[PDB]
């Protein structure tokens, strides 16, 4: 399974920071229609010091039946930088990738994307490299401000950097905390809004894909 090799992952953090916004240009924010047939949901863990683990699943829309699931493990190297965390798991993600057999139509990280201090979260940044469709699910807010939404079943809120939408601060489950999504590449707020609502049973809390990839993770 391909990718597109936009850039080196071996740089210096000044470097890094340099890229993302080289490749923010590159981000199109574009309204994802209809349904996808295959969503994959990723899970990256570090059971290490320096050791990664990637784990992907592929689920079929609307059954979320599990098609597909891979794993890679990988060193870690680079250092831990907040706003420059896709320079830790990218390069092990990708590993994931390419042993995948089933070619997904949408994907769904763990980490946010348009929230980003340079706008290039994971879900930004892979997609790129991907070229398709990904969005960001985070169980806890890394960027951007917001009011809280009510305590009522897929209530939601604007998620915000000043003015600007960066995404959505979503009530999955009532009385548990919201999720937090942002788009990545190929995917506005608005889409990905409806997108993450569609990939959740009524009413857990955590988006099928991403809840899967995390079960399996688990499982190893």
């Given at each position: 399974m391909d990718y597109r090799?936009?850039?080196?992952?071996?740089?210096p953090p000044e470097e890094a920071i340099k890229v993302q916004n080289e490749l923010r240009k590159k981000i199109k924010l574009t309204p994802y229609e209809g349904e996808p047939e295959y969503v994959a949901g990723v899970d990256l863990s570090f059971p290490g010091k320096e050791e990664g683990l990637a784990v992907i699943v592929v689920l079929e829309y609307p059954?979320?039946?599990?098609?597909e699931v891979v794993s890679e493990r990988g060193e870690i190297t680079f250092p831990y930088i907040p706003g420059l965390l896709a320079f830790r798991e990218g390069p092990l993600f990708l590993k994931a990738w390419e042993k995948l057999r089933t070619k997904p139509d949408v994907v769904v990280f763990d980490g946010q994307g348009l929230?980003?201090?340079?706008?290039?979260?994971i879900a930004s940044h892979m997609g790129l490299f991907i070229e398709i469709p990904t969005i960001g699910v985070a169980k806890?807010?890394?960027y951007g401000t917001f009011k809280m939404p009510?305590?009522?079943?897929?209530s939601w809120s604007y998620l915000y950097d000043g003015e600007e939408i960066i995404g959505c601060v979503i009530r999955?489950?009532?009385?548990s905390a919201p999720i937090f999504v942002s788009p990545g590449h190929l995917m506005d707020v608005e889409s990905s809004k409806r997108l993450i609502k569609a990939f959740?049973?009524?009413?857990?809390?955590?988006?099928e894909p991403t809840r899967l990839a995390h079960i399996y993770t688990q499982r190893l």
């Amino acid at each position: 399974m391909d990718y597109r090799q936009l850039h080196r992952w071996d740089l210096p953090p000044e470097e890094a920071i340099k890229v993302q916004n080289e490749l923010r240009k590159k981000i199109k924010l574009t309204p994802y229609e209809g349904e996808p047939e295959y969503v994959a949901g990723v899970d990256l863990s570090f059971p290490g010091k320096e050791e990664g683990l990637a784990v992907i699943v592929v689920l079929e829309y609307p059954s979320f039946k599990i098609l597909e699931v891979v794993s890679e493990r990988g060193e870690i190297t680079f250092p831990y930088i907040p706003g420059l965390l896709a320079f830790r798991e990218g390069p092990l993600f990708l590993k994931a990738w390419e042993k995948l057999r089933t070619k997904p139509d949408v994907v769904v990280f763990d980490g946010q994307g348009l929230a980003h201090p340079r706008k290039l979260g994971i879900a930004s940044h892979m997609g790129l490299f991907i070229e398709i469709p990904t969005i960001g699910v985070a169980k806890s807010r890394l960027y951007g401000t917001f009011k809280m939404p009510e305590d009522k079943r897929c209530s939601w809120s604007y998620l915000y950097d000043g003015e600007e939408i960066i995404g959505c601060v979503i009530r999955t489950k009532e009385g548990s905390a919201p999720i937090f999504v942002s788009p990545g590449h190929l995917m506005d707020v608005e889409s990905s809004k409806r997108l993450i609502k569609a990939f959740t049973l009524p009413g857990r809390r955590i988006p099928e894909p991403t809840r899967l990839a995390h079960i399996y993770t688990q499982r190893l």
